[PDB]
Design a protein around this ligand. Structure first.
Ligand code: NAG
Ligand code: NAG
Ligand code: NAG
Ligand code: NAG
Ligand code: NAG
Ligand code: NAG
Ligand code: NAG
Ligand code: NAG
Ligand code: NAG
Ligand code: NAG
Ligand code: CL
Ligand code: CL
Ligand code: CL
Ligand code: CL
Lengths: 372, 371, 371, 372
């Protein structure tokens, strides 16, 4: 028996890209592991259709989503952008095939699509986990530095802190033109802002650290908190002995033996090298959709046509399994809110930079709050 | 001769909707007025295709845009919500037909689409006017109250003020599960927050005023600023004798006699007012019509979204539209040539006195405030 | 006509070494430039013998010096390390051929050799400039960090300050078994030692800066002084925006246009810089050439170290060299007539600003500091 | 059987010197005793070649070292200066005949000669023995007065005291021009510096005492520590009753009967009168090299030529015996560090001036520290 899934990935070169990125590789990686796994889909071969497209091309994303639907798939692991994903989301809702999302995207409440889940930990919860950390460090003031216009929406639960708890916090945006953040850092330095929360990509975080050291802000006077769940992927050796306090989060359950086995195996496969959060969530996504097909009553992949009208009769029940799903993945205990389909409940590691290196100094969940 | 514009509008019932909404009306209304203007497209006839769809339905929007492109249009006037226009923009760009946009949309920098303009005043500029106004009242501390998450992304040049200036700024959000903003208001009142900025629709604004009064907050101790451009359209009679300071903006150039004439024609087809959406759509349709007249000869073509052919004269037309300069209902209209966004524009500043709401100044990105 | 200078240089592989080092290059480079200067030894041709030897090998040095004297030279340019030149100096003095020295050497008072000069600025004078600078920053307490034992003998006029002035001075040494100065740095940081003087090579200095930053000590709370004359040659871009105060000295007269011209020719044969060793060797070779031209007629002779004959014109030449006065790459050059040492010279004082490293003064044994 | 050793000694008059100095006499003295000793080299006559040269003449030192090497010797007891000795050291390393050193000399680490030992107690250890004394006297401050530029290098372990233990110490240099140290003593007196450590020759120490008494600093308010191991050779009778505290060291094991027998016999030989440290170390050196030749397997003295290339085949093994050597000499328990060849482990007497005269009030070694 053969079952098929669809993946759409964004590449700087679109369809012409010749070298495979980590998302797509993680995809192919997890499909292969499930096919060598004797306990999961033992008699079914999990195959895929992979489509490569330019960044920020909704139209192209629509064209490929329809192609895959015509080819027949049980789910579409939609594109990684926020604009491209809100087009495939609508299509998956019309044709009733599950859409799987890996990165935070804005879900307007007044938007009534239900045919999706989202594996990235919800930013409302993340904002709370940051607040519990900050209240625990006793900070009475702090600055929030975010990258793109979207940070304010992601951090709204955090920005509305002054009106609840007693912490005055300033708010600054990294330059849109340049990725030279020195002029900003000069302003924070002059402003004696010593406790800072940086919301931004692991890439941009590496830059900010390098440049904070150039500005003489990598000392015992400073405490940085990073929102990136890929903190453990930064080379922090050049900053290890400076004496800065540096704290962030980790959702990847490294303390678990079979997870470490998978991350090691993953890096052995890489040719460009750790497993970042993007790949780990996709590996978990492909597993949840597989595990769910197995517990779902027998269904078939149907060729659906976007211009046509027919929907997928099995979709509704399948989507329900996925939502109700609860599975232990690389990124720990996985579960979605049943109505929103968002991953608003999860477990975080609180990690902190020591001389000896990054160290797990606690944990957090929405129910138990902080625990150091 | 005949030119055809495509229009896509969003409804709660989708296509099934029975009644036109204000926007679709302002669309039909403005196409009709140019066909009667003998000084504008005199011997050419503007026509339109009109599609109705459900809110937040990009898939539907996609299909209707493609239907229209296959029909032959020189421009498409996209939906309102910010989710659908991402899809239609992308299409208009692949086939190179101008996409006219009327409401604020997030335009990521990474995004390389060029076949659009957007007639809504850029919120980065509105944010700057709001700062100029706050600092002009000499406010040292305020409270920013907003509605949908997207309000943040908009007022950002304002939220980042407590480090570009001496001002302390609390932040709150209207209830998402209700229209009952009373509980919030109790907390602002306890908080002794007297100077407040409300980002929200004119509808919400009317609800907020009525509830603010009920809460004992409509007095001379309070000063509210509204960012809604539709402020002048609210019934403020229940409030003008309370002592409250109430201030905001207006982009509809009502001072102009010819605008006032038009605002009257329209409101006689709708107290004798024309909202921003309607007036911006009216200005969009004119701008496109006038840029067609002005440009060289060109032909409309049927285009397939599955085929791979772009509109020949597309690029030529799109530049006429980006470079356009036009005195519309909403004042002088001009676009940033690079971004296609309306970052330069004029605002009238209005305020609530006993004699009623009145213009107590002006603003522009160049001159800032003038009173 | 032909004059011949002898050069002895030290290498890790000794004679076997394949690649020239900077010094031997600056030697060949400077002999070549005078042979092209028609205003200097116009109709006479400067040539050289060059010997390579192992570091710290006086026996080898002895043999090569003797080889060269038997070949016929008007001067010998001794090795770098301080162990070997004691031997070659003694030889040059017995046979009375000038020994040119380029690096600091201990010159015991009991020692009665007179056939040498030494172009390195005397460290007793450098020590005085370092005091003038410290007392000018109004430092009340510092920490002197040095590399090799010999650093002490050099900074002595500075170490003896806490009884010739009100200043309290801790003393530390870089690890001898490692280049990892981090552990030391931890102890200075705990010690709250913020004002620090580093005596060490430019290489070591670069290591120290990089490790100081890693240790969280490159900030506005710290002020480092470097005694290395090669400071202006370090890449300080990673550090100029941190706020650190960084100060030191420069004897290369880079302000002078003609020096800058030359520094450029050389670095195009090596970011476009010329270290002190290279520039001092260049000045030595000129000084000797110019003192030959200026002196009376004289002949080179083959001399045996086992025989007992001294160079006839030796003493006459040696006095021309000791009494020499010359504007070289390293500024005005002049020697103490008695000691043959360079105790009088000019220093530019440089400091690290955002705009980069720059000259914020000058110094000389006569006028002391001037800012 | 005849075996031969080489000695080079520095004389103010060089080769023309007619009156023999104490070093050279000690040399000739020990050779004679070994030749009358029935238990040490019973069947071998120890002969020598002695060369006299000017002070600070490396070239001359090289010429004589080569002459002796051509003549064939089993060791060369190199010249007493620091500049002259670092030339013979190199030669002995090339030709592989042991070089024997009697006085502290700078051994740059980056210098890779191995064909030498040095009998003077290492100054790093001496600095430690001084520190243990000072910490034991409870001094919280003190001045260090040294003579020639070299003192700082010899005393580095002591000068870096402030950053380890808690003792603030000033640092002053005796005048290079003059041996009139009164102007300096005036400055220390005015500066109320009462606890002083003088690093300098026994000759210069005698001068400083005489002049400290003239300056009225020879009282119960003052405590002087002298580094010179020749302290016992100073006439301290004029200062004995002043009440000053005056402490120094002694490596010459006087408490040993056969040592006193040798020192008495030595003074009986002198015509210019105690045995100073210079002569005693040379007597010990000549003995260690003899004792080592006897335990070494049979070897021969070879005529080596400096211009030639050949080295001495027996040298390496001989040098090894010498380094590994451990012998009780006039200067107590003798042993070298096997890699450095320096005498960094030894035993000191702590002596102090009383009314009744100089008295042994304790002992010190690097392992046991101080013991009073
Ligand atoms: C097989 O799949 C099961 C169920 O998810 C998982 O627990 C197990 O680790 C997998 N085995 C291997 C070795 O892949
Ligand atoms: C850094 O952490 C330490 C100890 O964990 C804390 O005492 C200190 O306040 C922190 N630094 C800042 C600037 O908060
Ligand atoms: C799940 O999300 C929904 C939709 O926002 C929310 O109303 C509900 O409170 C959540 N369920 C629970 C019990 O957390
Ligand atoms: C209302 O406006 C008046 C002046 O126009 C000002 O004096 C007063 O302070 C304002 N009210 C508040 C609470 O700011
Ligand atoms: C148009 O807008 C962009 C983006 O905000 C801005 O950077 C640029 O200055 C504007 N272009 C011109 C030439 O005015
Ligand atoms: C750095 O230099 C400035 C003035 O140039 C001085 O005020 C400051 O104290 C210096 N830093 C230290 C730690 O001495
Ligand atoms: C040369 O140097 C010596 C030694 O430092 C010094 O004493 C003397 O004053 C100098 N000679 C002259 C005449 O300048
Ligand atoms: C003979 O030499 C031995 C061994 O060093 C020594 O112990 C003894 O004192 C010597 N005897 C005499 C009287 O010289
Ligand atoms: C001299 O020694 C005595 C007793 O041994 C001691 O009490 C006194 O403090 C010493 N003098 C000085 C100046 O240290
Ligand atoms: C002997 O000296 C060597 C060379 O400096 C040193 O490394 C070693 O620690 C010493 N040996 C011992 C065990 O004292
Ligand atoms: Cl199966
Ligand atoms: Cl109303
Ligand atoms: Cl460098
Ligand atoms: Cl025998």
């Amino acid at each position: 028996h053969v079952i098929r899934i669809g993946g759409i990935f964004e590449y700087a070169d679109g369809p012409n890209a010749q070298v495979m990125n980590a998302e797509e590789h993680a995809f192919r990686f997890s499909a292969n592991i499930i096919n060598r796994n004797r306990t999961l889909l033992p008699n079914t071969t999990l195959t895929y259709d992979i489509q490569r497209i330019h960044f920020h091309d909704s139209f192209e994303a629509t064209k490929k989503a329809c192609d895959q639907l015509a080819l027949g798939v049980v789910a579409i692991f939609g594109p990684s952008q926020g604009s491209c994903t809100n087009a495939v989301q609508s299509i998956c809702n019309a044709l009733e095939v599950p859409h799987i999302q890996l990165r935070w995207k804005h879900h307007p409440l007044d938007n009534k699509d239900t045919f999706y889940v989202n594996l990235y930990p919800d930013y409302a919860s993340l904002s709370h986990a940051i607040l519990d950390l900050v209240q625990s460090l006793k900070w009475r003031s702090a600055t929030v530095v975010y990258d793109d216009s979207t940070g304010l929406i992601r951090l709204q639960e955090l920005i509305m802190a002054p009106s609840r708890y007693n912490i005055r916090l300033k708010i600054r945006q990294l330059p849109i033109d340049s990725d030279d953040s020195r002029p900003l850092l000069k302003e924070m330095k002059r402003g004696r802002e010593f406790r800072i929360i940086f919301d931004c990509s692991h890439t941009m975080a590496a830059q900010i650290l390098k440049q904070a050291m150039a500005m003489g802000m990598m000392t015992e006077y400073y405490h940085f908190i990073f929102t990136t769940l890929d903190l453990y992927a930064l080379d922090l050796e050049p900053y290890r002995y400076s004496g800065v306090n540096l704290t962030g989060f980790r959702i990847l359950n490294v303390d678990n033996p079979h997870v470490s086995a998978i991350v090691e195996k993953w890096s052995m496969e890489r040719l460009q090298g750790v497993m970042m959060t993007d790949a780990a969530l996709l590996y978990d996504a492909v597993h949840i959709v597989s595990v769910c097909y197995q517990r779902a009553p027998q269904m078939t992949v149907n060729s659906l046509q976007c211009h046509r009208h027919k929907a997928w009769r099995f979709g509704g029940r399948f989507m329900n399994f996925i939502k109700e799903a609860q599975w232990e993945g690389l990124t720990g205990r996985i579960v979605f809110n049943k109505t929103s389909g968002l991953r608003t409940d999860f477990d975080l590691d609180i990690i902190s930079l020591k001389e000896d290196g990054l160290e797990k100094v606690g944990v957090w969940s929405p129910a138990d709050g902080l625990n150091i």
